[PDB]
């Protein structure tokens, strides 16, 4: 029952992304694929075996190789999400690497949670129940283009003026475009680092 028609429809529905890729298109043929995108990594899809599967290279997105399966197999084959969400995850990784020297000693710690596929949250914790802070990161309206609006959650009791006093040397509630968010992330990490090493 539609034995070859299954692969026929699969390829006929997946070839749509070949027009919108605009990256290095594909070095692979049917029963597999590859849409490799680097500067100067590739993702090994699957089509046979379950139903489908994805496979990656060891850096920068393995934090979501369990949220991508549903988006790939169920919704559509329109994975234009990586090409516009890469810098954010690069910043995530560089921050989680730069906070290394603190976790050795008893200085502090930083966690990242990814409440959904787009709504992300980051949390700083300090040793003696001094503080427990959590900032939400979320995209917003697309008048010209998408904009990330990072800050304290909306209806969380702000607990005014305990350390937001210090955190207001950066306005504490930013808004950034999809090309220069790393500067804001680093400027927000350095302040908390200087406040924790004291």
């Amino acid at each position: 029952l539609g034995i070859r028609v299954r692969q026929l429809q699969r390829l006929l529905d997946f070839l749509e992304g070949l027009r919108r890729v605009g990256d290095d298109a594909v070095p692979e043929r049917v029963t597999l694929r590859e849409i490799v995108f680097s500067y100067g990594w590739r993702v090994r899809l699957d089509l046979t075996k379950g139903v489908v599967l994805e496979k990656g290279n060891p850096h920068l997105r393995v934090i979501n190789r369990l949220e991508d399966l549903v988006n790939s197999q169920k919704f559509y084959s329109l994975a234009t999400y990586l090409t516009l969400s890469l810098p954010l995850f690069r910043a995530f990784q560089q921050l989680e690497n730069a906070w290394q020297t603190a976790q050795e000693n008893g200085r502090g710690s930083c966690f990242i949670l990814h409440l959904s596929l787009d709504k992300h949250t980051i949390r700083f914790v300090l040793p003696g129940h001094q503080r427990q802070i959590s900032l939400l990161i979320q995209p917003h309206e697309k008048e010209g283009k998408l904009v990330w609006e990072v800050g304290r959650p909306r209806h969380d009791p702000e607990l005014l003026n305990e350390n937001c006093e210090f955190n207001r040397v950066l306005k504490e509630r930013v808004w950034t475009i999809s090309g220069s968010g790393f500067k804001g992330l680093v400027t927000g990490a350095a302040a908390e680092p200087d406040e924790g090493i004291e």
Binding site: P58, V62, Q93, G106, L113, L115
Partner: protein, 164 residues
């Protein structure tokens, strides 16, 4: 043998993970025949909800990191698991707050459907419910943080096969 236990202990923890990621949702899809199945929707809801607690108890069985935090105190290793390192990620005090939280969606739904002695486009007090999302997405994650807090302590003793 400690190698053979820490291996597949990391597996038990990776496997109990993604349960939170699948439970973040509740998928309340409503949109006589139509009646008598809202209770079955709530049935499947409480179904997917429960059986997380027994797994929590099974994890608290072989929770063996309260005994390693002591050695971790002074200059503990404390290496967080960055999935950029293990590309596999694949095969080879209370949480009744969740039920207490779900319990506030039958009553504030009855109070929304008790508007037939009322207008048509004013029963939309569902400009509320922006508190339950916050409360759940906080309760589940404030204890999801424990998995990341303990998976680090897991390999404090298994640095290089505990022997080299």
């Amino acid at each position: 043998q400690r190698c053979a236990v820490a291996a597949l202990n990391l597996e038990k923890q990776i496997f109990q993970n993604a349960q939170d990621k699948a439970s973040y949702d509740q998928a309340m899809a409503k949109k006589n025949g139509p009646a008598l199945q809202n209770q079955v929707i709530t049935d499947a809801q409480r179904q997917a909800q429960i059986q997380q607690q027994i797994q929590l108890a099974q994890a608290q069985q072989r929770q063996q990191q309260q005994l390693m935090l002591n050695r971790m105190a002074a200059q503990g290793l404390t290496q967080p698991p960055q999935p950029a390192f293990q590309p596999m990620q694949n095969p080879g005090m209370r949480r009744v707050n969740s039920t207490t939280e779900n319990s506030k969606m039958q009553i504030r739904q009855l109070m929304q459907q008790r508007l037939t002695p009322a207008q048509i486009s004013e029963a939309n007090a569902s400009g509320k419910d922006l508190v339950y999302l916050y409360f759940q997405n906080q309760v589940v994650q404030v204890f999801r943080a424990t998995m990341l807090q303990a998976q680090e302590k897991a390999q404090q003793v298994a640095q290089v096969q505990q022997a080299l």
